[PDB]
């Protein structure tokens, strides 16, 4: 056992975000023929 | 550069049937196929984007995504579930590029409701109340049975545990406590033998 | 004396994962070190990384 | 005297629960019924007495781990951690945390496996913690009782067909 | 004459763990003829539920005149 003064239980990995940027949202183009 | 339509055409040049439409590129342009009505789409359709490469094969209402649907984003992340007003809402499932799976409720395009997130690297699962794509309360379960019940920080705190109780199945000990700012675990009493947190 | 096993080699992943956890050695060479933080191996790999 | 009495009563309670569990396991063999009904009765007995989260019987893509029972002709299988194993199959297609156990139903005077009793603890519908040896022993005993009952069922069916 | 032995036939059919191949084929055909949803007797496991006392009564009830 390392006898340093520092240790703490590990937090869970951060859930990964969505494709939206910090937001852009892709939209179907609506133009008639 | 009017977009080309191939399929049945109603009066006034309004598409009215099962056909395919291709749009002019500004990198190919987009392409829709499926039922259309009076210039707007309705029913089970498939829209393939040009620049990004996303493909949405799902229902349509009033020219917007609505009802059950399934999308493959530019990143290999695949969503599958309910849509309202071309925004992810209601119950569904999401598969991330990392392999992490999420089952639960969405609201305004984020994780929100009662859901479970399963990581790929470590088999740990987060189960409970999500808000704004973050974990608020519930049970964080390891791959063997050891777990932690309590309140997790929001999206601001990156879903870190803040207060609650640890249970370790290797030794079968239960300890209740909280986390300091530095991350050090501070317990309120000495550990005691117990059992898993089955709500 | 007695039997004498040979520890396998050590990879950078095992060394990096060992710096995160803090365990008492059970004394036998086939024992799960931890579920989280995840460790890539059994007791022998943890012992090799500690060494 | 008080301490001695408390210890004695704890021991008596443990013996009582062991006796009632074994008595239930002995009853299933006696039941005469359609095979699906005998399987359903076993599932109920396993769920009530054991701490198992769910009990279900049953009558490239990795080979499901339950096929090990048929291929290696081994009567009982126990996976303490499904996370460690890779041949385990999840019905709802979502990865689960917990243990698993499956002890097949082998008819006596033969070796053909007819049914399979699978009891598991998977979060969140289950404890998610390894089955204690008493639970596993109960699952084995229930499966043996079911084996005797199924042998009786086949015997009666053959007699009726030849009648 | 079919419904004469309905109870015995149902009892012998229900006690079978395995799949009696030819008999399963004729039972599946008969279930198609009686206009069942056809997605509920694909495998023998699901086809077990369909046969019961009511099966023999339905056989007489089904119209033999309709085209």
The helix/strand/coil state of A8 is: coil
Shortest Cα distance, chain D CAs vs residue B92, angstroms: 13
Q: CA-CA distances (angstroms) from residue E47 to D38, D43, D150, E36, E37?
A: 19, 22, 21, 11, 12
Q: What is the rounded (10 degree) CA torsion for A18, A22, A23, A25?
A: -40
Element (H, E) at B46: strand B40-48
Q: Looking at CA atoms only, how far is residue C35 from chain B in angstroms?
A: 6
User: How does DSSP assign B115-169, residue by residue?
Assistant: EEEE-SSS--EEEEEEETTEEEEEEEE-SSS-EEEEEEP-GGGTT-EEEEEEEET
- Closest CB to D161 among E12, E17, E45: E12
| CA diameter of chain E | 37
When CB atoms are compared, the residue of E12, E15, E48 closest to D153 is E15
Whether residue B102 contacts residue B111, with contact meaning beta carbons closer than 8 Å, is answered with: yes
* Cβ atoms of residues D28 and D49 within 8 Å: no
What lies within 8 Å, CB to CB, of D119 at 6+ separation is D46, D47, D50, D52, D54, D55, D56, D101, D102, D131, D135, D139
Instruction: List residues bridging with B15 in a β-sheet.
Output: B9
* CB-CB under 8 Å, C37 with A1: no
Question: Which segments of D4-150 are extended strands (E)?
Answer: 54-58, 76-79, 98-106, 113-122
SS3 for D141?
Answer: helix
Residues of B in contact with D81 (CB under 8 A): 143-144
CB of B107 less than 8 A from some CB of A: no
Tokens of D96: 């689960």
**How many contacts, defined by CB atoms under 8 Å, are there between A and B?**
82
End-to-end CA distance of chain C: give it in Å, rounded. 20
Interchain CB distance below 8 Å, A32 and B97: no
Containing D143, the helix (H) or strand (E) segment is helix D133-162
List CB contacts (< 8 A) between D115 and chain E: 17
Please report the residues numbered 13 through 72 in chain B whose beta carbons come closer than 8 angstroms to any beta carbon of chain A. 13-15, 21, 23, 30, 32, 39-41, 47, 49, 52, 54, 56, 63-65
CA-to-CA separations, B186 to A9, B153, C36, in angstroms, rounded: 11, 17, 19
Residue of D nearest to E11 (CA): D34
E47: chain D residues, CB-CB within 8 Å: none
Mutate to test the interface with E, among D106, D114, D157, D163 (most CBs of E within 10 A): D157
Residue B45, C-beta contacts closer than 8 angstroms, at least 6 positions apart: B32, B33, B34, B35, B36, B57, B58, B59, B60
Q: How far apart are CA B25 and CA B23, in angstroms?
A: 6
Enter the tokens of residue E45. 């496991």
d(CA B96, CA B83): 18
Q: Which helix (H) or strand (E) holds B114?
A: strand B113-118
Please give the C-alpha separations between residue B199 and each of A18, D65, D126, in angstroms, as whole numbers.
30, 30, 10
Closest by Cα among D140, D127, D151, D153 to D46 = D140
Phi then psi dihedrals of residue B174, to 5 deg: -120, 130
Closest partner residue to B146 among C35, C37, C38, by Cβ?
A: C35
The answer to whether the beta carbons of residues E23 and E14 sit under 8 Å apart is no
Closest partner residue to B123 (CB to CB) among D95, D124, D129 is D95
Segment holding B64, helix H or strand E = strand B64-65
Chain B, 124-163: which have a CB under 8 Å from a chain A CB?
Answer: 124, 126, 133-135, 140, 158-161
C36 and B143 within 8 Å at the Cβ level: the answer is: yes
Q: What is the stated resolution of the deposited model, in angstroms? A: 3.2
Place of tokens 């987060």: B126
CA distance D100 to chain B (A): 12
Cβ contact (<8 Å) for D157 and E45? no
Residue B196 has its nearest CB partner, among D83, D94, D128, at D128
* B31 contacts B46 by C-beta, under 8 angstroms: no
Contacts of D17 (CB under 8 A, 6+ apart): none
Q: Which residues lie closer than 8 Å to D88 by C-beta, 6 or more apart?
A: D64, D65, D79, D82, D100
- Structure tokens given for C49: 């990384």
DSSP at B71: E
Q: Do A10 and C22 touch (CB under 8 A)?
A: no
Rounded CA gap, B197 and D158, in Å? Answer: 50
Q: DSSP letters along E25-66, please?
A: HHHHHHHHHTT--SSSSSSHHHHHHH-SHHHHHHHHHS-SS-
Query: What is the end-to-end Cα distance of chain A in Å, rounded?
Result: 73
Contact residues, chain B, for C35 at CB < 8 Å:
122-124, 142-144, 146
Q: Phi and psi of D133, rounded to 5°?
A: -60, -30
Name every chain A residue with its beta carbon within 8 A of the beta carbon of B14. Answer: 32
D-chain residue closest to B124, CA distance:
D97
């Amino acid at each position: 056992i390392k006898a340093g003064g520092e240790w703490s239980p590990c937090p869970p990995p951060p859930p990964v975000p969505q494709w939206g940027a910090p937001q852009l949202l892709l939209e179907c183009n609506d133009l008639p023929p | 550069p009017q977009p080309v339509w191939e399929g049945p055409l109603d009066e006034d040049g309004k598409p009215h049937g099962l056909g395919k439409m291709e749009y002019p590129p500004p990198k190919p342009g987009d392409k829709f196929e499926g039922t259309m009505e009076h210039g707007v789409r309705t029913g089970k359709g498939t829209y393939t984007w040009g620049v990004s490469g996303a493909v949405y094969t799902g229902d349509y209402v009033n020219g917007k995504k609505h009802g059950k649907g399934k999308m493959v984003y530019p990143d290999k992340g695949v969503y599958e579930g309910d849509w309202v007003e071309d925004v992810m809402q209601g119950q569904g499932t999401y598969t991330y590029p990392n392999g992490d799976i999420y089952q639960g409720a969405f609201w305004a395009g984020k994780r929100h409701g009662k859901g479970m997130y399963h990581y790929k690297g470590p088999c740990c699962q987060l189960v409970g109340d999500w808000a704004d794509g973050g974990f608020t309360y519930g049970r964080w379960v390891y791959a063997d049975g050891s777990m932690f019940m309590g309140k997790f920080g929001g999206a601001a705190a990156d879903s870190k545990p803040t207060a609650g109780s640890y249970f370790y199945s290797s030794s079968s000990l239960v300890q209740e406590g909280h986390f300091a700012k530095d991350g050090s675990w501070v317990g309120h009493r000495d550990p005691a033998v117990g059992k898993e947190f089955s709500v | 004396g007695g039997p004498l096993q040979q520890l396998p080699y050590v990879t950078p992943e095992q060394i990096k994962a060992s710096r995160l956890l803090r365990r008492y050695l059970t004394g036998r060479l086939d024992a799960p070190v931890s579920a989280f933080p995840a460790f890539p191996g059994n007791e022998a790999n943890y012992l090799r990384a500690l060494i | 005297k008080d301490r001695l009495v408390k210890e004695a009563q704890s021991e008596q309670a443990a013996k009582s629960v062991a006796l009632t569990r074994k008595e239930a396991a002995d009853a299933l063999a006696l039941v005469t019924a359609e095979p699906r009904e005998l399987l359903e009765a076993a599932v109920k007995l396993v769920k009530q007495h054991t701490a198992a989260g769910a009990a279900y019987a049953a009558v490239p893509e990795p080979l499901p781990y339950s096929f090990r029972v048929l291929d290696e002709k081994l009567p009982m299988l126990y996976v303490p951690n499904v996370a460690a194993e890779e041949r385990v199959k999840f019905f709802r297609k979502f990865p689960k945390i917990g243990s698993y156990q499956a002890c097949g139903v082998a008819l006596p005077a033969s070796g053909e496996f007819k049914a399979l009793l699978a009891a598991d603890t998977l979060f969140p519908e289950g404890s998610g913690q390894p089955l204690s040896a008493d639970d596993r022993d109960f699952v084995w005993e229930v499966s043996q009782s079911l084996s005797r009952a199924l042998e009786a069922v086949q015997a009666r069916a053959a007699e009726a067909l030849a009648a | 004459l079919a419904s004469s032995h309905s109870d015995a036939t149902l009892s012998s059919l229900r006690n079978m763990l395995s799949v009696p191949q030819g008999t399963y084929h004729v039972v599946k055909a008969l279930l198609h003829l009686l206009g069942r949803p056809a997605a509920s007797f694909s495998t023998w496991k699901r086809a077990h539920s369909h046969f019961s006392p009511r099966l023999f009564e339905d056989m007489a009830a089904y119209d033999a005149t309709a085209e």
